[model samples]
Target chain A: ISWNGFSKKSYQERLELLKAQALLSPERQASLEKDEQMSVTVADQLSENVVGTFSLPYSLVPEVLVNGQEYTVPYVTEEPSVVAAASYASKIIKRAGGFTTQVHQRQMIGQVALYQVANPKLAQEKIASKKAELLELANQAYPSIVKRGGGARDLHVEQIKGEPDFLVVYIHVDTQEAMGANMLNTMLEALKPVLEELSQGQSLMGILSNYATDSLVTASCRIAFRYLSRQKDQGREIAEKIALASQFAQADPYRAATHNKGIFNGIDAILIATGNDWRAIEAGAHAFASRDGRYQGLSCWTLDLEREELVGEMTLPMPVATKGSSIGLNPRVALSHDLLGNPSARELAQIIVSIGLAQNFAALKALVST
Target chain B: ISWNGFSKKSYQERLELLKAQALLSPERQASLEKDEQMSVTVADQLSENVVGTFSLPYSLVPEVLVNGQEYTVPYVTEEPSVVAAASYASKIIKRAGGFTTQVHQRQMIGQVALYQVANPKLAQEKIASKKAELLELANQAYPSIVKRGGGARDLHVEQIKGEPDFLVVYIHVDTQEAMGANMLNTMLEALKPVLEELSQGQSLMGILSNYATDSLVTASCRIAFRYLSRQKDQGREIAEKIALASQFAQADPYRAATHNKGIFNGIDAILIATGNDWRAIEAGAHAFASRDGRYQGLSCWTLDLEREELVGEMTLPMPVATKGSSIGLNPRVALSHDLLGNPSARELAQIIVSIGLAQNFAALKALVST
Candidate 1:
């Protein structure tokens, strides 16, 4: 797109360049130009006490190659280094065949907790036994979701440890192209009454969970020794040190905090630009970091000596979506989705997780190549 | 401030109300009105590939009474319920004399790791013995910071477990209202060579850590049961359930993730409004959540039955700054700081952490009462 020295040009000049090079229409370019006003309108609708719109730099990181496709991702952040690092890391990864990502599952989780029941085991068994009715009843809570070929799939109940009757019902559903927070929340509201009737207890709360363990994305990258370092022997040395640093993060929470921070620095920018809730992603990722009893680094760097490749792999709950909440409200997000060819929810998640992995490799290389 | 039905008013009307009721100056009001343009100019400077500015709602959360003072804090967020919850919870706590807070310690942490040294104990002892020199050298690395009355305070060397020579030098500095990332990085750069000279090993890397345990803020709220519910008996019942829900969060990671998310929903808004790094705060808070060997909730709610109060207490690393990192560039943030009475670093941390406590209580009340 000939986007070199983009910061040096005036906004109008840059806008013109983006118009011709990005193949943007007049409507799209005007929306980008008048984004501040567009956002203020959306902001007022989104909040009760909207004073105005708060602005962050909407920067682009091009050459983000994931699963054999290259996409130019927009990142909204105040931190310049994060945006720079993502582009730099993506280009480095691209030299070695880019990143490959897989979404293990893409289901939303809903919870309905019950209390005051005398026998927790019996209530849990009854709730699980009614899975057939439970599924249909949940779908009925939000019919259009089921009409779109996705609805509640799995329903179960678990009894909390050391509680006499604190049983929680969990419902997992594939939310299609949407995040499904509201969809799941509506379904939970409907199922809450049924749960109370079956469990013979009052419902504590019915809501969607941010600890979305079922909706996880795994991203990996492989870089040949030749791409890791300019010096031939130093590539292997740097690769070894990267692996060693990853081990250090696994051992120390202090190191792990900063290590994961770098990854989120890359991830949050994309989240903000695309109208996703970054706090939800942060909550799930950090909670997953503590899943093994201690907080640890999300990504691991390992040296494959036989193949002479440096391998980076990362897996975390990617609770992101393409069509939900404030997604279509922001014209900037609309442009972002268009620029990236408007992938489905799972594909968008793959790209986001890949950016996180690339950013992790960038931090490890910077930390170790001293 | 007669802010009833603020959403029904137009932007001009609400802004005028804020001007008269909040005692805002004409200059301040003008800046608030023109915030988007100011942010774009700043955003261009902050990034290399700047396209335009991304916007979130800048909302006012009034009546945040902390330490016996009332603050109409500004929050920048995409989440509507976060701002709503903060205001609702703050008023409820205000009826019980507001939140009491403590800034136990406020210091920035720096790390310079050493590798390939054989005599770990001797080298560590050597660095420890030269604490005076180390402190002076670090201050000299960034002289203006020392001139401003806050500089390096404590210097020590720690040996990583199980390594023959892997040692790290830790420096604690009172950054004095600034985040001190750049100051600490510069200090580490100056001290890296000195560290290498004494340790007789190559330095791995020198940077600021985001764990930031020393820069901690603790906030506590004591709310009378009367404010918890409309009915007299229901207040106590709701308070008891709030405590019970907290226990559930402690026992379950699934609950803890959402509990903390509610807290950050309040905190990240303030951080963004003040132009601080939300990802850094998220990293430190989540990492601290796992400091007790498992991931648990950050805040604790309990019953002070003798005092007829439901008490909430929370402590987390609040590494927020008022005087650094692209803060004043955004007109909205400048106005935010003005609206906040231009609090110092510690005062800002207090307010941010207190908002977190208030938001946690709101979530607990809602979860348990239903």
Candidate 2:
């Protein structure tokens, strides 16, 4: 656990030491040391025209705390500064109350677009009126998910303004612990016919939306002046400079995009390490930035003048899963999850966002001091 | 070369056969067979906290033509449908003379922000007049690149409207085949003191911009009516449906976000496979999407009614590299470049944008058919 002079050590030495010490128990530690070649076969099974496996560095950021729980976060990235920056920021933020995270919903969205409807208004009315029936039909496709208390809950219908005879039915499904693309797709597929019959329309597309705005998770931290000050500058001065940088990002779309990219530098690392779909997370996070039309920073750093402290927070739709085909198939991904005390999807999101905030803080700190 | 039963073959069988075929020459094909084992070791050297390597499925999409050159494009991704969809779309697009790609500039951007300037206007004027001097300072750090026909070319000064005594200097450099982060960063670092002295202000931050708007690459395709038709409709009907879908994306940020994401499904895969930075590209792309104060689809699909065809084109800032420490250190990444025709940075950008347009076409086609 003592990472003193860690990077200075040989790769094999670091691997053996970290693997033996970082896992939850001895068996888990033993599992880590095994030379498991999981990529080639799994890669072949996943897609076609397979050449081989393309690998990225799998590493861990130690002692990341979220909501009173401790986790050694795993990160897969080629950027040298990310892992280093996240660790440094986490260390500073830990002196504060660490990170407090909250999840607003466990729901993922699926869109069912209906085209060539006889009457768009009539179709909307029919779909809305048959909400219960539609929900039931969606639920019937997946009994196991229903039994597990995750099924169709609500339906929303909207008529396309410019397009004649076009309507879209948004299906709100509780996917529970899963990212739930397949579940949502299956549910929408099963309900497509019933919707067609009820609305007298043809289904154009039935798929889960990667723009998962509803599944929102937030991570925040409060740090005082003392923690912010690193070298010649006072904590207050550093905090103010950081705020200035953040404001610049908020005002400039160019700055805002790179600002968000810094946040993803940490979030995507953990997502890839744990075998989650980073593209979904990236699309969701960046899109969420432009929710108000203009692209803005995903995380905000505000100075509490009265408290003489710095407060940082980040919120985004993080569509991720702890249980899935990729996670199940890859041993390293499974180990990564276990290494983090077996966090659920929400907990994982918390850890990821916390890392994001930490990363943003570190980046801004470096920028200010320089 | 024959992909009739490619998905049905074993991993080794696929690799053995693929390595023997699928390259420009025998030496390049043999280079593909080398296990490389580069990611973990190279990653360890790249950064701290080295655990191991995480691999993704590295596959190829065959028979893509951009500017009359055939290529077997490599893709690394976990999504099941991306490779299949892109390949299918490419096949259709090929019927219409493939893709015509254009690269506007090889220039990358670097930003140097100066704060608390004594005289903002005077500072801006001084920097503007000393553009050649600044370019010389930037080029001093990388002579090899200059020898190879790449270096600092121009500069622009912008004064922050709201923030008094604040100014930004944008350095435009012809990176040629390099992503040029190091080249740009070193230039800025070297110029910071000179700028501080000249402007009578402290440099706030000096770094390369991921929002490389100037280095724009575009890929466009013109597909005839016959190529677009599926089992359910003729090409005209499908093209109309696609335009409707495109309109929805343009109007709705939610739809636009996913639409852009589908583009990345192809673009990011190639980026990773080639060991380029997907984060930088993602940030540049999404921010460019919101340039007009509202996030819009990066690509546009149009119904060419008079020509009886479908026209699609995508334009964005793609900051990528065909040469870097990351690519140089990893043999697989190096081989990936050779596996194709050893494209220049511009050529790679052309291929990527072409793939992205093809992907967008494929997604729209699937939605209409469904």
Candidate 3:
């Protein structure tokens, strides 16, 4: 059942061992063994002008304790050191306590841009007044979501200060369990005419914004100072240097970019494994980091000298889903989700943010120990 | 020889046709037919704790023109509308003129963070005084790159404000044709001892910065106003609306994030098809967008009233390679490069940036036409 040092064995040996452990079903095992599962036929159906399938390695990081739940984190990446780094950091954190995480909000937004309006302020007022009716109109596109306890929650309008008459009407939707791109896009498309008529404006664009600032997840952890020691330095010294490195990133955009990339090296792999959109998450997180005009590091580290511990924390927009395009279709993706205890979207968000925190910790540790 | 609408046909038909055109050799064809090409065996070695492979659709956008040359851009993505949008925008741009692009600089940075320096100002002077000797020490790790007319070019030392003892020594290395991760990291690691001796400081970290601000590529195209028309609007009106929409992204972080994601939906596909690292490129591009402190759109669109033209331009860090890692090892990646005229890293950077512009244009067009 142990997957540690699993990479050292032959592919056949590893495959047999996983099969013996019954981690994969017979059909799933067959799918992984064949090239036809993600064949050109499937590739074409997935998109356009299909040539073949391009693949990245899918691996697992064992012993990842997220909110005290032991998880074998599924990861998909071609980059080296990410899996190792995450495992290394998670082990260190486990000595103190596992990651403590929270989701502040889970609302997603869909925007309908209105152009050629008679008066921007009047259009905004009209849309705001008709908020209840607009939410009802939006919910009609995905009635099943409402029956399932998630639907359009609120309506907002912004008078964008450009082109004289441009206004953006945003629909706040509660997508409790789904990633909700299709649901949100369809709802926005359906509401375009109604929005145009209500605001006395022409609809220009309607779609879900990948910038999910409304849906945020924060994860933090403390690594005991005694566990932070390297071969050449005391634990306290290493903790101070880690904080110093974190400050450098927070101060410089050039360093912040790489530091964030290090975080995604773990986050993206898990996203890929869960059949979620890594690009969307990457777009939202980086943009949020630069919301204040100057780009800053997303993760923060401090030497908690009072507790003699090094504390790391990260907060970012994590718009992810448990059910989507590739979720049910790919057997490996399905297996990955099942293996992770079939976490809901919010739960997955918490786990991913925790992994990102672990990854950042490992990065700083490596930096200070060098 | 035609690949347009090729997704409509059967996989066998498409495969046979590609083979008839000699796009792939017999060995490569066999590799595609078997699982071992990108199987668990290969996956285990590519990274750690390998389980299986995660695949995306490798698609193509036809009739893309860059610098007066025709290219059927190879793309790999799961997102719908991206390839179609790129092709549609490319067709419109080809009618006026193809993309004109330039590489402003090709230098990358490797940071050597020094801690516990005895005398800050004296150490800075000592490091700056021995720039030539430091460059020599850095270049010695990768002599072949020096032989190929690319090596460490300049040295920079910054006294970071917060920590008086903490300083960052940046080595500006001209990586030439390679993406230079290994070269830069190795060079920095090799210079750690020399830097410590020169500055009388302890080296904390030595690694390549993914924030490749020094390596920048700019791509721009002029779209005639006459070709900007949609079903309901005239060319001039559509052009103005597009410029307005571009301004929206430049003004709002929420819009800018999705706008940049639209650009990467094209760029990432090409990077994936060519076996380049998408994460590194994504990090650099997004970080560069926030270099001015606020997150902004990577591409800019403006209407030239006198010339009756709509101009689009995009500039960002493009740290990619043609001779590294999976580039040569993967047969399909080689084919992708060959299909695009076997461009060097600079040439590839130019082509990718042009695609990003086309992608952004299509995104705005879709938004305005709603």
Candidate 4:
């Protein structure tokens, strides 16, 4: 339990309380709920202050079952209606095969900014020829990541002729299911030494590029008229209008501006809940939104005449991880995890993208209906 | 004094500590800082688990000067060098001219959904004749606001064939300052009866138009090349690129996406520092960004050869107020006020726009140079 305006209890005590509320196996839930051992809030990569520390009272936020097996979710929003709405929407969508998703695996690039490279073109060629050695170097830095099927996949360089004269070398890495920031940053930091040795140029920024346009995850869904509404005529008409509005955003930059903002309403909420680098994510999403040098909507929806159905589609980088640092320490995340039935990172990413697309749908419905 | 993360010491205690460390009241500065009550954090806006409150130390941040008067700004960002950079940039622009800004006074609109009109054309006529009475009703809700110069001004109705099944009535009201949510709601709530009576329909969603496209304040400044390092060639080139970029966003949506994101970068940072509603501001700004039916950049820049200067301009409905609610509660905002030496709401709005414009310049310089 973290300290909130509503609670005076210590984080550890709150965590125990939430644990006890979980409907897990009776013994496990009971023992953890009542067992009192104090936990300390240590400074991490996030904020220096600790508001209050508490674990989730229940390991899960409780899920609704559609196709038999259960699914739990965690929500840490201040708004009263979001979770309920999500549950209701999720229930409706589940009847239509839940959410079908396809991800273009996590391929992230970290830039090594090289300044004062006298022979820029030659340096680029040398770097290209030594790709094998660079891969080995990246592997050595994150051996565990490599063993787990996550490692540097390629090396590319760009000779930038702008002021302060720098050559930017891009090191691309693949993290299977998760949005891989931690790993990419670590690998880049590890490659600094090798990069310096190879080019004899000072490396400035070694961090991930917010431009994830090259690597993206595209997810979509379709809902039948009945699930959208019980009323036959109005329901189908409403669905068509909603799809039309979503398509408007997808086709026009003016509409895309609001469309993407709609998506971020849910995405940013989750990022804040999970304590991810939202600014970085914001940068990435906005930059990616303008990949054609023209800013446009990242998601699209329409009435698919071929199937005579309303279709909602979206594509963007959903770089979120279920295990580790930010999520590991929060009590609410644990509850969210339980609500999600403790999904793997890839599963979590899929759900996040799905929810983002769903949120866009909800916004269109609200906008069009109102 | 609020007890936040660290520094159990009160404001005076921290001032004393700064004095002891020779960090307070820089040499040639007249006096010690006074204690001002300000809001740093609010409950239920973003994260909820705030047990005991903690705040970032102001003295540890950087110094800001406007027109030869120096002050300290309190920043609450995790990045190492951002606050310092903001201060440095502020100093450079200050040398040209403190800053000049004018706002298209704060007037926002709320929607009154009307239906069941016997005749659409007749209803529009009736609403027009009843505007005066409706405006009076709105003003009566906030006597204090009316006395201080803010209330409803006009009402316009529209016939929509849209699915919402209601006629749209745009109700316009002026908010003195402080993003005017309470005042807007008050006026709208008070006017509902009159609106209902005149239009002969129920009023729906009477609140601040988060799409604040009409109410806007613009800030502009012209700085000499000497202020930007006195390199004529470099300065001229930077100016040309900026002019081109501004025109690009104005003419095409492709460049406008990145352009508008830059505007919010400064706006959101200040909003965060002040503990204001960044989401609401972002929603309005993004929505307004595409109001021309094309999502384009929010700010514009140009180079004036006659003045031998680089001029930057920014316009946005920031929806900030000085006298109301959360603005005065955050200690961080208080420190920002302290830094500005008691800047009026208009002055603060001016500074905000200036910062946003300057930030836009810095980004263009960096991007063009790179």
Candidate 5:
């Protein structure tokens, strides 16, 4: 019942555990014996109306070098080339030294919006008066996170200009080791009444923002000209082409949208395998892409002529977690975590960013050559 | 071996089919009989370095009325509340006559960026001179889409401004019932030489843009105030809050990002179920959100006080397809398709858009409520 070491055991061992505990219906046990999905019992519990489950390739791309360490990354993708492409580029980067990544102090964001505000300046004055009180209330609402060394860090308010200007209250919190959507939502919901009272307006909504600029990770790779070319004849040419392609993405939103999609082709796979929320990450990454008034590529590749390297770098909101919904429930996710060397939330986000950079390199190489 | 109606069969029947052909290794078959995933054999063939497969809950939200017809939607997701929320919103909308949707004449866009041009005017002139010829060459690149009553339809050029101005060639293609990424890429690749020759410049990259402006869908619903609120007295008040929440999303990117993320909670589930590229849809949807220079909400909620109706509508580039990578290979995908009544690409896109609108409604309702 504790599901101890459940992820490390063989399927037969797991089957015996299920049978010993009488955890499932006899009909389900019989069905599972023939064709179980990642653990239909676990999947069913996470959702409703689950008559069945679906599966995608749970693949491993071995020896992905990042920060002087080799990570055998796991990917969950339906696309045929995603795994192969990720593996191919990781190998090339590995040969020319590995990726260097840095993750910022991870924190999640939550918003409480106040509408029907007649005077924005007066509302801000009132909110500013009770900012400390509200932050305390948020922490009190989620006491467990504070014990874990992550809780409400700060709070601020922004006023929008319109016919009926609205005020939004933002709370930054570190949820440590979890994706923290539920925690943030709870904290914000608890603060909603006070936010409305302080702002002197109706509380429109209170929820977590997927535009996670606070949770940021940067991954960069420097590959020599020879590493980029297959036959070694067009090494410099390929580097220039790849760099040019990156610039093209910057100038054109059309190209940039697909460019970011290619990056996520590798990023989302790892996220899914680890039971991280891909939809949340996608929202943050894309929204971050447009942060500079125009949508552009999340990653940038430039030819470092003096260094004789094709330098690639990407920094986006990689707000993944080591704990979350159904993560502990699914044995496959458990195994994936262990296989990833039981990386902390910060480390997992760093590794995911490295994978995205690697995927981008492989895609650019093929696009330029072919 | 034919795998005909394989999706509709039982797990035991599928096991027997695998055993009859020895379609997998003995150890694999043994592991499978204990705790198998969506069909590791099928998942393995999809990508390289595949050691196994992963699974998510494949759930059904029953009797979602769209366009006067009831659809049982299948969702693949790990998040618990998504399925429940989708089901809840659908039930409310069903009571209110449900969602109405429209899909534009679907086409895909590809970009071929040309760099290092000496005379931009001359380059454009030459490209103009050979437009018809290049269109013919593009169709020749992939003739299969032609046989399917779809092919290269139009071409144009754009000049990007910067230190060194670049010319990008845009090609519009219709790949009926298909996501069209590969088809468009092949056509663009085929035109690379001609594009480079005509412009006398290097072709930076030739690939399909996930911006997907051409492939678009719109979904809308008009629910009475009674449908929006639980109790009668708060109906108008709750409707006002919902409308303001929508406006908050429009005014602020932070709220807008999460607003869209909630929509995709339902959209991506169906996309994964039907084997469409969620990354593509995510890219197009978010990028479209920023098309007007600032990131904003995709769906809009307006309080129609005169009509006594709360109206909601959303339009994004859906760009889903009936046939794409690994669709036919995965039996679960087939089941999902059939579960949704085997919708065409257009119809599927329509359904997905409606689900997004529905999802937005549910999220706003809850955020405003609790």
Candidate 6:
């Protein structure tokens, strides 16, 4: 809320001032004045949870110089440490030729939830028998993606125990360049008849799997103390000190948890700004962090004392799409990209992983000093 | 998007055929014409990873009617299961005269990052001598919180070893009702002067701890099987079945992971709708879930076969607030309350826990059938 250091005024006076100041357009003012007493109404069929809708204004922050070239990136996160982490890392890594990112294909998996199976063990066998047919059907729906060397790869059926009984028919899909929700959902929905016919069970749910493992991004940074030798003392020699800090957290969960949060601080905020599913990403990332059966660090660090070098690497599941349901429709999302230089989802995934890795480095550096 | 079947014919021609005809509002018409155009503007800075921002018309949802009394509620999720689970639980529990919720006061611990000492072991001993004075300094600012049975519970000092140097000071506080970020940060920042005088160490990060254990919210919901029983199912039998299902998950990590995800399905939606920090809350909730040295179920279920009753209970670190931060001002947040029929944070916590219980019941009930 913006406040002026002046006396308060009545509603009408404020409205007039707002109009004069270009805060309220003529059409908006006219609508308010003409329909001030208009009755608001809704259809009787609306649900009990329907609420009002709101929109945010549009604005892109200034460009950040990346390796002598100005690169504008819009960032949306209320946390202060996040913005600072990205900028600090960017500053350090710019000399390393900005951030280098690598990614797997834009792939997603859809599950056809089949429940009430008679035999748990036999169900997997039965599903496997029709794997070739299922793959063919899936490929037929999107021949272009399949022709591009992306289609159904792994098919597995896992039995879930319950009185009603259930099995999940997981299909690995290569959904290039799109968030892949609609494509995956459409494929699953298309396979309903085939799945129902074979299983003779109820098809309860068909949707994209939030745990997108096949699609992932990884990034790295190598910091050398030779670059920091010029500074007589910026508290301490940052490279070796940060390397020690990372080792401390790697062996300790007390520090590991906060260390991970800092990674998500940049990761989740960028995810939110892009309109991608942060929760899904969070779920997958956290689940992977604990994949060894115990929650652990998502990034790693090591120091080569001989050369006084600190190296870091991070890996996380980031299945993002460039053109999708929302894409550039909303001003906020577009502004986010404007700030980010409008990288494609694959490109964005690379940058994010790089940022996640760099973030870990920055936090470790700060912890020992400031 | 309304597909108005109206042609480009004269309005009079259309009116002659029909008593009333619909037309798009001028604003809506402009929006429709510009639908393909990327508006790309929103509040806060934008990021490259956003897929879309969803709109929840919270203000227009129908009110919930319980025993002829209407209750308004706000929901932030676009998913079906959330609304279905809440409505189902609300209907069944309404017979028991709605849900009863108990809330604990909010609390937080501010940490004074103090490192570097002559004798690290001795420094810990020295800090222990003036725990009372340290707490006293914190309590001096806003003594009212202490009078209200909140703020400054204890003080702790920790040591760091190897390579460089470090020490840490933790001050526990009982914030009461508020999330206490503001209060804790304020008090810690103010305590710097006194802290420097006492520890003779430089102050690093002076702020409230995200690891809040004292400011916790625990909620539970229970309903008779009669409420859950349908024409084919026995009420008592269904309750007992759900309880057994919980036991299975409690014993197995595979089941427990999926089980917790179900609980988060409801909790995260509300947290996001209310403008609370879902990521922080999520980290806390899941960490608290595993606080017993293993990541287990966050909620439990039990059955009183003697009474033919089914019961469910859930306890998590629910640090939510009805006032404070941007959460209170977001229009969608106001609508979420309307959707929930204006349940307080505590009451909302109750409903959320019930949904988690019900979701688990659905899974468990299916498992019991198996």
Of the candidates shown, which would achieve the greatest TM-score relative to the real structure? Answer: 1
Ranking by lDDT: 1, 5, 2, 3, 4, 6
Predicted candidate 4 versus true structure: per-residue lDDT over A1-370, tens digit per residue = 3212223344455445445445444543443344321132221122222121121111112233323444544443333234435555555666655667766766776666666587888888888899989888887887877888878898888775544456778777777655565577677777777777778786654656555544667777777776777775666776767755654444444345556765765665555445444454555566566655555666777776556567777777665666655455444444345545666665666666776776677666655553
Model 3 bad stretches (over 4 Å): A1-4, A16-36, A116-118, A162-165, A197-200, A230-233, B1-4, B16-36, B116-122, B163-166, B197-200, B229-233
lDDT of 3 by residue, A57-95 (tens): 777677778788878788888777788788888778877
Q: How far does residue B232 in candidate 3 sit from its true spot (Å)?
A: 9.7
Q: What is the C-alpha lDDT of each candidate?
A: 0.84, 0.81, 0.80, 0.57, 0.83, 0.56
Could you tell me the TM-score of candidate 1? 0.95
Can you list each candidate's DockQ? 0.63, 0.58, 0.58, 0.10, 0.42, 0.13
- lDDT for A117 (candidate 2): 85
TM-score of each: 0.95, 0.94, 0.93, 0.63, 0.90, 0.68
CAPRI verdict (incorrect, acceptable, medium, high) for model 5: acceptable
Could you give the candidate ranking by DockQ, starting with the highest? 1, 3, 2, 5, 6, 4
Q: Model 1 Cα displacement at B207 (Å)?
A: 1.7
Model 2 lDDT tens row, B1-370: 6654555667667666675564635665555555445655677877677777777778888778899997888898877878889988888888788999999887888888788887889999998899898889889977877998888889998887644345888888888888887788888888899899889997878878888887899999999888776545477888887887777677666677878899999998899878899998998898888888777788988888888888999997987888776687767787788877788888999999999999899988887664
Model 4, span B28-110: residue lDDT tens: 12232433222113422223322212222223322233334433344333332344345555556777774467767666766
For candidate 5, write residues B113-224 as lDDT tens digits.
8888988889988898888999999999899989989999998998897645789899999888988878888898899888888888988788999999998899999899
Go through the candidates in order and give the C-alpha RMSD of each one to the true structure: 2.2, 2.6, 2.7, 9.0, 7.9, 10.1
TM-score of chain B of 4: 0.77
Better of 3 and 5 by TM-score: 3
Using lDDT as the measure, name the better of candidate 4 and candidate 5.
Answer: 5
Write one digit per residue (lDDT tens) for candidate 1, span B1-370: 6666765778778788888785466788877776544556678888757778877788888888889988988887786677777888888888888989999999989888788887888889889998999999989878898888999999878877732336888899989988888889889889888888888887877778889999889999988888887786888999888887787778667778888999999999999989899999999999999888878889988898988889899998997888765676777777788889999889999999999998898888876665
Better of 1 and 2 by TM-score: 1
Candidate 3 clash pair list: A293-B293, A293-B294, A294-B293
lDDT of 6 by residue, B1-61 (tens): 2112222223333222222312233443333223211122222222221222323212211
